[model samples]
Target: EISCEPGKTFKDKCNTCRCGADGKSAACTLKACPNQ
Candidate 1:
């Protein structure tokens, strides 16, 4: 998980632990500081 300032776009390097066992993929989540 990557965190940045309140209004910054941060890239989160994540891995799929159990993604239906089909295949493994990489993704990212860009959320604000006060996200829900």
Candidate 2:
């Protein structure tokens, strides 16, 4: 799990970290987020 302050840099880094090499597939998934 990853936590970050509410901001663009955090979001951007998180996106980059999760995105696929082709830049089209965003690896963001419900299973990846912390359990409610």
Candidate 3:
């Protein structure tokens, strides 16, 4: 799995996501893609 900072932020197709405190998990928004 990709490693991440506890609070690192990145972009998804439709929204932003953040790394979990464990540095191995991530969470993203559930919003729909704008041009999918």
Candidate 4:
């Protein structure tokens, strides 16, 4: 599982994410998966 802190940002695969107010979860925006 992915862990996130409130107000912080992280990237996972093609998703750009920011942690939510709960301080344990994130809200993510999905983009096209980049070639790896």
Candidate 5:
């Protein structure tokens, strides 16, 4: 499992991600980047 600080947000490649309340995982958006 992954660990992170709660409410912390960051970028994952072409996606936007945020740490969940549990701080064990991240929520990221599913999208495609043209240059990726």
Candidate 6:
């Protein structure tokens, strides 16, 4: 699993993860590409 500090952001090839104020978990989103 991936982890991050509060107010920090992490990313992979196609995803983005953002650490919340609690500093315990991260909120992630999948990136979108054109024509894919």
- Counting clashing residue pairs in each candidate, in order, gives 0, 0, 0, 0, 0, 0
Worst 10 residues of 4 by lDDT: 12-21
Candidate 2 vs 4: which has more TM-score: 4
The C-alpha lDDT values of all candidates are: 0.33, 0.37, 0.69, 0.74, 0.72, 0.67
Question: Per-residue lDDT for 1-36 in model 5, tens only?
Answer: 666887897665476778777677779786765462
TM-score-superior candidate, 4 or 5 = 4
Give the clashing pairs for model 4: none
Of 4 and 6, which scores higher on lDDT? 4
Q: What is the TM-score (0 to 1) of candidate 6?
A: 0.50
Q: Name the 10 consecutive residues with the lowest summed lDDT in model 2.
A: 6-15
CA RMSD for every model?
A: 12.8, 10.0, 2.7, 2.1, 2.4, 4.1
Error of 4 at 4 (Å): 1.6
lDDT against true structure, model 5: 0.72
TM-score, structure 4 vs. true? 0.58
Per-residue alpha-carbon lDDT of candidate 2 for residues 1-36, written as tens digits (9 for 90 to 100): 344332322233323434444444434433244335
lDDT tens readout by residue for model 3, 1-36: 655787777664377677767677667776766774
How much does candidate 1 score in TM-score? 0.21
- Residue ranges of candidate 1 with Cα displaced over 4 Å: 1-3, 15-36
| Shift in Å, residue 5, candidate 1 | 0.7
| TM-score of each predicted structure versus truth | 0.21, 0.25, 0.47, 0.58, 0.55, 0.50
Clashes of 3: 0
Candidate 2 off by > 4 Å: 1-17, 31-36
Runs with alpha carbons beyond 4 Å of true place in candidate 4: none
lDDT tens digits, residue span 1-36, model 1: 322343333333332222222233323343444424
Query: Who is ahead in lDDT, 2 or 6?
Result: 6
Model 2: how large is the Cα RMSD against the reference? 10.0
In model 5, which runs have C-alpha deviations exceeding 4 angstroms?
33-36
Clash pairs of candidate 6? none
